[PDB]
Design a protein around this ligand. Structure first.
Ligand SMILES: *[C@@H]1O[C@H](CO[C@@H]2O[C@@H](C)[C@@H](O)[C@@H](O)[C@@H]2O)[C@@H](O[C@@H]2O[C@H](CO)[C@@H](O[C@@H]3O[C@H](CO[C@H]4O[C@H](CO)[C@@H](O)[C@H](O)[C@@H]4O[C@@H]4O[C@H](CO)[C@@H](O)[C@H](O)[C@H]4NC(C)=O)[C@@H](O)[C@H](O[C@H]4O[C@H](CO)[C@@H](O)[C@H](O)[C@@H]4O[C@@H]4O[C@H](CO)[C@@H](O)[C@H](O)[C@H]4NC(C)=O)[C@@H]3O)[C@H](O)[C@H]2NC(C)=O)[C@H](O)[C@H]1NC(C)=O
Ligand SMILES: CS(=O)(=O)N[C@@H](CCCCN)C(=O)NC[C@H](CC1(C(=O)N[C@@H](Cc2ccc(O)cc2)C(=O)O)CCCC1)C(=O)O
Ligand SMILES: *[C@@H]1O[C@H](CO)[C@@H](O[C@@H]2O[C@H](CO)[C@@H](O)[C@H](O)[C@H]2NC(C)=O)[C@H](O)[C@H]1NC(C)=O
Ligand SMILES: [Cl-]
Ligand SMILES: [Cl-]
Ligand SMILES: [Zn+2]
Length: 586
């Protein structure tokens, strides 16, 4: 009966709101106050949500979706039929939860020590070294040490993790965990579509790579940089070489056109974490989008506590599944990078608020990439030299062609450099999950892809027992990553569309959509759909067409592509890494 299915969905919604809200609370209380007691309560709520998922998922599977007429009810019931880890038998579920906790803990407590010296945590100690050191051996100590202490220590857990997460996927009707993850996009052509996008960005990435490689050759010396080979992976300013903007000082196109030190400016002018989030809130409401509720300001953790609590510091945004309580947890630091992260996280909060009236089963983004993109779209406008000057964080940089190319290079060092990294992570994981990479070659296959996609090599030859993927957070925390590749493509599509809605003309990279109500209306209509419709509908609401496309990103960076090609040609660069077998001699 249509009526029995409707009743079921209503009962699922009521009970899920209660159970998910209790789990969100317990998880928040652990994350903002790590103790034995909060771990204990969290463990109990984890089991309560499993029992709820098992109960309602079992019921949902008794419905023949084929016989359901109402498409919304059909959609919800089909989704509740996927129990995820709660499909595992009791022993395997306990084992899986424990392996996940052990991997996450191992990663979070790993430190790198000098003998009879200080021990450095990843954040901020080791990331600061990677960002600021310009000494090959000091960078190497941090890069190798982090892999030695975090990566190698995850390896013992990962094969059993793969076995259990695949078993859960098969018990929910998928062939492996990678299949299950890809299904979140509801797009049978996903793999080919993503490959096509990656290929469209190759001219830009290869030209950026070759230009940066030449700059590294200048600084680190001819004996350590092969101008026809891959770049050593510890020289890009970031522990994973996923974004390169911390080496802007080594690659600036026009050193004669200097830029203000934005961190020093923010500190001198008394910026605080709360001010950073108020600025993000203001951008959202300038578009006519929703302000965060008063409760957000009361309950959020917007900087590291000084009351003796120990906390999880990573930036994060939290839906408590009651339509009222939304929070950010971030150990915010006062700099421009974290101002952008604040906008990223506030985009997650905005999406939570926009879809709060849907059934909790449809309270997700159109696809996971959409959820990641919203905040970054606003941050693109924030990052314009125009807007940064209005915050008193830059001197006037408009007009000047040199400042213009310098700005596009700054943007490309993050946005373009990240495209191959964000593609790589789940290309590797999909092949682990489908069994075509075994524990015998986890690491070799990781580096084959680091080479193939990013054009990087490890500065020190890897050895047996190395497990460098484990040194990247999302691997031991089992967080899918292709969402970030999707996000970095489509956020430029959204920027282009909103800039057009706002009446912007001229180069896309000069657009600042601040206070555009037309831009806000486009985003709001799409966000309010949550996960109720196939994501091409939200794509069309924003952009006027239904596809993912790299064209907007290419248009944004067109002046840099032209500059890079001219620069690389006059130095005779050989794009790519035909000497792909090269690795450092010392
Ligand atoms: C197939 O079934 C689906 C699902 O049906 C729903 O679920 C099943 C299981 C059963 O329970 C059904 O009884 C139930 O309807 C059908 O899809 C639904 O279709 C109805 C149309 O009949 C749509 O009605 C709209 O719903 C919105 C949102 O409603 C939530 O939020 C409201 C605001 O907080 C609140 O009032 C509601 O009670 C509801 O509350 C939330 O409910 C969810 C669970 O669903 C729960 O998780 C949340 O916790 C809970 N939140 C809170 C806070 O309680 C409602 O806002 C709409 O009102 C507008 O539209 C009317 C029609 O146009 C109009 O008369 C109203 O005045 C109002 O109009 C707008 O007003 C503004 C300003 O005044 C104006 O600017 C706008 O232009 C104007 N809109 C206009 C003119 O269009 C309305 O009631 C459901 O949204 C929809 N649900 C989903 C999920 O899609 C589907 O129709 C079925 N298909 C077929 C072919 O039959
Ligand atoms: C805890 S939750 O699950 O309930 N809520 C999720 C978000 C809603 C999911 C909806 N279903 C959440 O808070 N997640 C945390 C995660 C943290 C960040 C993260 O890891 N970023 C990746 C990739 C990246 C992204 C942007 C960028 O510029 C550079 C890199 C990384 O750093 O490698 C670190 C700061 C930027 C995001 C996030 O916000 O997406
Ligand atoms: C951090 O967590 C501990 C453990 O839950 C909290 O301590 C509890 O505090 C309440 C009073 O509010 C007592 O009723 C419990 O008995 C306490 N338990 C223990 C083990 O001490 C503590 O309040 C939390 N701190 C913060 C700042 O939230
Ligand atoms: Cl690595
Ligand atoms: Cl994803
Ligand atoms: Zn995010």
């Amino acid at each position: 009966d249509e009526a029995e299915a409707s009743k079921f969905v209503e009962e699922y919604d009521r009970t899920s709101q209660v159970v998910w809200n209790e789990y969100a609370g317990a998880n928040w209380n652990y994350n903002t106050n790590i103790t034995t007691e909060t771990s204990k309560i969290l463990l109990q709520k984890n089991m309560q949500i499993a029992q709820h998922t098992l109960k309602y998922g079992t019921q949902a599977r008794k419905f023949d979706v084929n016989q359901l007429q109402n498409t919304t009810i059909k959609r919800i019931i089909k989704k509740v039929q996927d129990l995820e880890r709660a499909a595992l038998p009791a022993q395997e579920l306990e084992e899986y939860n424990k392996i996940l906790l052990d991997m996450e803990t191992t990663y979070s407590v790993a430190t790198v020590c000098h003998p009879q010296g200080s021990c450095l945590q990843l954040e901020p100690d080791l990331t600061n070294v990677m960002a600021t050191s310009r000494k090959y051996e000091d960078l190497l100590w941090a890069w190798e040490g982090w892999r030695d202490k975090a990566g190698r220590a995850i390896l013992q857990f990962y094969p059993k993790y793969v076995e259990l997460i695949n078993q859960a996927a098969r018990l929910n009707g998928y062939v492996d965990a990678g299949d299950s993850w890809r299904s979140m996009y509801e797009t049978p052509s996903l793999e080919q579509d993503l490959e096509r996008l990656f290929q469209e960005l190759q001219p830009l990435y290869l030209n950026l790579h070759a230009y940066v490689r030449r700059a590294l050759h200048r600084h680190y010396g001819a004996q350590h940089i092969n101008l026809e080979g891959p770049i050593p992976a510890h020289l890009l300013g970031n522990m994973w070489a996923q974004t390169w903007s911390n080496i802007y000082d080594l690659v600036v196109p026009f050193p004669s056109a200097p830029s203000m030190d934005t961190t020093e400016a923010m500190l001198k002018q008394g910026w605080t974490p709360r001010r950073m989030f108020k600025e993000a809130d203001d951008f959202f409401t300038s578009l006519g989008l929703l302000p965060v509720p008063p409760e957000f300001w009361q309950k959020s953790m917007l900087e590291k506590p000084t009351d003796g609590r120990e906390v999880v510091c990573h930036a994060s945004a939290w839906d408590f599944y009651n339509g009222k309580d939304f929070r950010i947890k971030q150990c915010t630091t006062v700099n421009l990078e974290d101002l952008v992260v604040a906008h990223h996280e506030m985009g997650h909060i905005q999406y939570f608020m926009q879809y709060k009236d849907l059934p909790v089963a449809l309270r997700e983004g159109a696809n996971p990439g959409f959820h990641e993109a919203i905040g970054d779209v606003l941050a693109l406008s924030v990052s314009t030299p125009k807007h940064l000057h209005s915050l008193n964080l830059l001197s006037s940089e408009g007009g000047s062609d040199e400042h213009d190319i310098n700005f596009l290079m700054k943007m490309a060092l993050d946005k373009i450099a990240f495209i191959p990294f964000s593609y790589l992570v789940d290309q590797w994981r999909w092949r682990v999950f489908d069994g075509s990479i075994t524990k015998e070659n986890y690491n070799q296959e990781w580096w084959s892809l680091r080479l193939k996609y990013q054009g990087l090599c490890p500065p020190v030859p890897r050895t047996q027992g190395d497990f460098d993927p484990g040194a990247k957070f999302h691997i031991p925390s089992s967080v899918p990553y292709i969402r970030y590749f999707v996000s970095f493509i489509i956020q430029f599509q959204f920027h282009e569309a909103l800039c057009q809605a706002a009446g912007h003309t001229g180069p896309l990279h000069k657009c600042d959509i601040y206070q555009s109500k037309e831009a806000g209306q486009r985003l709001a209509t799409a966000m309010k759909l949550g996960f109720s419709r196939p994501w091409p509908e939200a794509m069309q609401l924003i952009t006027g067409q239904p596809q993912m496309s790299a064209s907007a990103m290419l248009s944004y960076f067109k002046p840099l592509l032209d500059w890079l090609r001219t620069e690389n040609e006059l130095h005779g660069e050989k794009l790519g890494w035909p000497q792909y077998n090269w690795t450092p001699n010392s």
